[PDB]
Design an enzyme around this catalytic site. Structure first.
Site, PDB file in Angstrom:
ATOM      1  N   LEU A   1      43.543 -15.949  -1.709  1.00 33.63           N
ATOM      2  CA  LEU A   1      44.020 -15.120  -0.607  1.00 33.63           C
ATOM      3  C   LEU A   1      45.532 -14.920  -0.697  1.00 33.63           C
ATOM      4  O   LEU A   1      46.302 -15.723  -0.180  1.00 33.63           O
ATOM      5  CB  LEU A   1      43.617 -15.754   0.728  1.00 33.63           C
ATOM      6  CG  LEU A   1      43.907 -15.121   2.095  1.00 33.63           C
ATOM      7  CD1 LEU A   1      43.648 -13.592   2.159  1.00 33.63           C
ATOM      8  CD2 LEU A   1      43.083 -15.872   3.138  1.00 33.63           C
TER       9      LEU A   1
ATOM     10  N   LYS B   1      53.243 -26.320   6.924  1.00 36.04           N
ATOM     11  CA  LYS B   1      53.272 -24.861   7.006  1.00 36.04           C
ATOM     12  C   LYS B   1      51.897 -24.310   7.360  1.00 36.04           C
ATOM     13  O   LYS B   1      51.789 -23.388   8.165  1.00 36.04           O
ATOM     14  CB  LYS B   1      53.800 -24.219   5.712  1.00 36.04           C
ATOM     15  CG  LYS B   1      55.188 -24.705   5.215  1.00 36.04           C
ATOM     16  CD  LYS B   1      56.196 -24.981   6.341  1.00 36.04           C
ATOM     17  CE  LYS B   1      57.340 -25.912   5.869  1.00 36.04           C
ATOM     18  NZ  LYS B   1      57.113 -27.397   6.070  1.00 36.04           N
TER      19      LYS B   1
ATOM     20  N   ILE C   1      50.789 -22.163  10.548  1.00 31.77           N
ATOM     21  CA  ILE C   1      50.084 -20.910  10.333  1.00 31.77           C
ATOM     22  C   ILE C   1      48.787 -20.836  11.141  1.00 31.77           C
ATOM     23  O   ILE C   1      48.439 -19.780  11.668  1.00 31.77           O
ATOM     24  CB  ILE C   1      49.838 -20.618   8.817  1.00 31.77           C
ATOM     25  CG1 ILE C   1      51.171 -20.312   8.127  1.00 31.77           C
ATOM     26  CG2 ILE C   1      48.874 -19.438   8.648  1.00 31.77           C
ATOM     27  CD1 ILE C   1      51.134 -20.246   6.588  1.00 31.77           C
TER      28      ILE C   1
ATOM     29  N   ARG D   1      48.206 -21.589  13.959  1.00 32.28           N
ATOM     30  CA  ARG D   1      48.443 -21.195  15.341  1.00 32.28           C
ATOM     31  C   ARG D   1      49.081 -19.813  15.515  1.00 32.28           C
ATOM     32  O   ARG D   1      49.347 -19.378  16.634  1.00 32.28           O
ATOM     33  CB  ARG D   1      49.230 -22.293  16.057  1.00 32.28           C
ATOM     34  CG  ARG D   1      48.423 -23.567  16.166  1.00 32.28           C
ATOM     35  CD  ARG D   1      49.263 -24.769  16.581  1.00 32.28           C
ATOM     36  NE  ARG D   1      48.418 -25.957  16.717  1.00 32.28           N
ATOM     37  CZ  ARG D   1      47.796 -26.316  17.841  1.00 32.28           C
ATOM     38  NH1 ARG D   1      47.923 -25.589  18.947  1.00 32.28           N
ATOM     39  NH2 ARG D   1      47.047 -27.410  17.862  1.00 32.28           N
TER      40      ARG D   1
ATOM     41  N   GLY E   1      39.442  -9.291   9.085  1.00 30.54           N
ATOM     42  CA  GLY E   1      39.792 -10.236   8.023  1.00 30.54           C
ATOM     43  C   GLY E   1      40.937 -11.156   8.412  1.00 30.54           C
ATOM     44  O   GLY E   1      40.957 -12.324   8.028  1.00 30.54           O
ATOM     45  N   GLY E   2      41.883 -10.613   9.173  1.00 35.72           N
ATOM     46  CA  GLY E   2      42.995 -11.355   9.789  1.00 35.72           C
ATOM     47  C   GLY E   2      43.684 -10.417  10.767  1.00 35.72           C
ATOM     48  O   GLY E   2      43.398  -9.212  10.773  1.00 35.72           O
TER      49      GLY E   2
ATOM     50  N   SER F   1      35.117 -18.954   9.834  1.00 35.75           N
ATOM     51  CA  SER F   1      34.122 -19.512  10.740  1.00 35.75           C
ATOM     52  C   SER F   1      32.670 -19.275  10.281  1.00 35.75           C
ATOM     53  O   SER F   1      32.426 -18.632   9.236  1.00 35.75           O
ATOM     54  CB  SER F   1      34.352 -18.985  12.163  1.00 35.75           C
ATOM     55  OG  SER F   1      34.164 -17.582  12.232  1.00 35.75           O
TER      56      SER F   1
ATOM     57  N   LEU G   1      49.442 -25.904   9.020  1.00 34.39           N
ATOM     58  CA  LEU G   1      49.151 -26.240  10.400  1.00 34.39           C
ATOM     59  C   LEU G   1      49.912 -25.337  11.391  1.00 34.39           C
ATOM     60  O   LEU G   1      49.398 -25.027  12.453  1.00 34.39           O
ATOM     61  CB  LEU G   1      49.382 -27.735  10.647  1.00 34.39           C
ATOM     62  CG  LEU G   1      48.434 -28.651   9.850  1.00 34.39           C
ATOM     63  CD1 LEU G   1      48.755 -30.136  10.049  1.00 34.39           C
ATOM     64  CD2 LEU G   1      46.958 -28.362  10.148  1.00 34.39           C
TER      65      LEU G   1
ATOM     66  N   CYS H   1      33.538 -11.086   2.003  1.00 35.44           N
ATOM     67  CA  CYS H   1      33.647 -10.392   3.300  1.00 35.44           C
ATOM     68  C   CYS H   1      33.192  -8.965   3.375  1.00 35.44           C
ATOM     69  O   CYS H   1      32.885  -8.492   4.465  1.00 35.44           O
ATOM     70  CB  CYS H   1      35.090 -10.372   3.800  1.00 35.44           C
ATOM     71  SG  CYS H   1      35.726 -12.037   4.035  1.00 35.44           S
TER      72      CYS H   1
END
Lengths: 379, 379
Positions: A254, A38, A42, A44, A298-299, A202, A40, A143
């Site tokens: 998260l 799941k 996610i 993408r 953040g996303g 990152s 892996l 963040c």
């Protein structure tokens, strides 16, 4: 207030990693499992093309029998992170046209290291700053740290203004998240939880110089004037966002509530911001779409959520998308990187309706849940 | 400047570790060794009778087969450390006569936890402080934290002074070092080195309220007026003092040069402090012996070094010895504890020459090596 950003500097590390980087490492260290699968998938769905890293999937730190210890992570923060911070700081100072002796304070932030003396000590020494430098190394905010540091610096600038003293503050954020890939992989495999941190994070260092304008010539050029700021904590949301100290570094917290909570805070915070300085703003800078938005990406859900909550288009946060897609989420370091890229030429040509905005709203969310906003005037 | 300390609160935990305590855990978890034996000898002549602790030698965290991990340390920092901080804060605020609503900033420090959200969040929450509170959680600085946080607060106060705003700043220090006894014991045993950290460090929370004087309950009482401050880094002394993050917490770093470096820094730092304000002070307050000294008691030689270098009697640092002997070295929390103790009647009974001094030099040292001084006027 006489507050201005006179220089900005950003340094990404040497490597840019695609979505297969974590696939490679995952297959290497763990057999297939439901939670891993799941995660892996996610990886993408993020809409992140490439992620900046201090190394590649073959780096020896992430290739030991076990994940590296928090001690081993620190060693790499210092050897590979600290040089990014030095260069970022240099570039900010060079644009500001300041010599090291002119720097009066340093406000630095990170959530990916712990150390005594802090990492800000080593950066300062490399830059050759005053032995009398007043330093603040912020902790505990993840963040939201770039904008938190900027606001902290602003209060410190005014402190000097009150005493008729010049202030020139190096504002610095450095994050090395990619080194914790093995820590996250082990948690996913061992706990069978879909932890999406490895999909988002990152490495980066970013810096701005904030001046209080005392002892600068009238008419000295700045990049942004800092007009105002707001900070609020979202109630009973501690469990939703965080980073828990661990033998292996920091275990990301998260939850799926984050996008929803963050979205609900935009309008009320923006209203507070605007109503504090509406009399300072021209008629053309009244409503949310009238501004450029320097949003911490953040996303993906943050950006689309912001466009939904505030009636904005993607192009309103064009520099946020550019950071996100090309470099990913560099935690506290991302916001200054967003402010840096926003003022570059190729960004200008992408402005909504060809309209490069005189005023910019910066926005970031972090553990707390802490929300930060600020109003900038772009020269 | 209009900066004053209007309240102070200290909260030590209930338990005291006698010199026997490390002997007990030493024998329970390690064979006899030459290095262990040296540390046990040194432990008898530190000058400390009792170390304040969140637990006794039989506490479960330090009695597992292994030393606790940095994660397990964090759990006890939260369950047993934060309540100390909340109580210390309540007492500072009570003395200041402030309701939670009047608190505008919080500057907090620790070197014995890492977390996001940081520990200041949970304190502010339990205190019922505003969701718009401006927080700063300092990292990287160890024992100089108290005075570094007091200085930062002063600048923040002045920031609000510049804008004509009242400022009331909760300055908070919390350390829990005793929980790292098994980490230190394991480092002594495995590496065969004399690590004296375990003989010295104790647990405490301490806090002050620093007011900018704007919109005060007028004719405003204060305990101390903050008149000035000085901060310096001693070059090329990073490796002499520290706290390296570790899966077991933070490993103490402490070279032989520390006592010499610290003592030698007093003369120039004092001269600079006084040059910046010797025009404000009466002629009866010119030389170090003219003042009462609120010294951070890092060790017994730190205090004797200061007496020697500065021409002081132990009575000049009476409250420093009082905390050191009875409670040990609580790192960043000690200095507000010294300041709180200093203004008490039974300290007045031990003033040099029966002369309680109107002006007070605060002094501390930590990883950097960072050095802090401040000048205070006692009401």
């Amino acid at each position: 207030l006489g507050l201005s950003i006179t220089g900005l500097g950003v340094q990404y590390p040497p490597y840019s990693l695609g979505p297969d980087a974590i696939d490679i490492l995952s297959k290497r260290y763990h057999p297939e499992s439901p939670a891993m699968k799941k995660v892996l998938a996610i990886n993408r769905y993020t809409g992140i093309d490439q992620r900046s890293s201090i190394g590649n999937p073959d780096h020896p730190l992430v290739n030991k029998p076990n994940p590296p210890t928090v001690k081993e992570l620190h060693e790499v923060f210092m050897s590979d992170g600290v040089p990014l911070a030095v260069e970022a700081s240099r570039k900010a100072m060079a644009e500001a046209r300041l010599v090291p002796a002119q720097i009066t304070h340093m406000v630095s932030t990170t959530c990916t290291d712990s150390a005594n003396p802090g990492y800000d000590h080593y950066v300062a020494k490399e830059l050759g700053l005053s032995d009398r430098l007043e330093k603040v190394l912020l902790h505990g905010i993840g963040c939201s740290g770039g904008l938190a540091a900027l606001r902290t610096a602003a209060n410190l600038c005014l402190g000097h203004t009150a005493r008729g003293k010049p202030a020139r503050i190096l504002v610095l954020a450095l994050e090395v998240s990619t080194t914790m890939v093995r820590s996250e992989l082990e948690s996913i495999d061992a706990l069978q939880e879909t932890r999406i941190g490895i999909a988002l994070f990152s490495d980066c260092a970013s810096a701005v110089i904030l001046s209080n304008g005392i002892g600068e010539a009238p008419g000295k050029p700045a990049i942004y004037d800092l007009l105002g700021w707001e900070n609020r904590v979202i109630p009973d949301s501690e469990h939703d966002l965080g980073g828990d100290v661990d033998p292996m570094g920091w275990k990301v917290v998260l939850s799926p509530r984050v996008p929803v909570l963050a979205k609900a805070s935009l309008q009320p915070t923006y209203a507070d911001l605007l109503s504090s300085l509406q009399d300072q703003l021209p008629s053309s800078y009244q409503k949310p779409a009238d501004f450029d938005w320097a949003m911490h990406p953040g996303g993906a859900t943050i950006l689309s959520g912001a466009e939904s909550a505030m009636g904005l288009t993607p192009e309103h946060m064009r520099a946020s998308y550019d950071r996100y897609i090309n470099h990913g989420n560099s935690s506290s370091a991302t916001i200054f990187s967003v402010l840096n890229r926003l003022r570059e030429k190729d960004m200008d040509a992408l402005a909504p309706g060809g309209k490069v905005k005189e005023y910019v709203v910066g926005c970031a969310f972090g553990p707390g849940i802490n929300v930060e906003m600020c109003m900038l005037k772009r020269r």
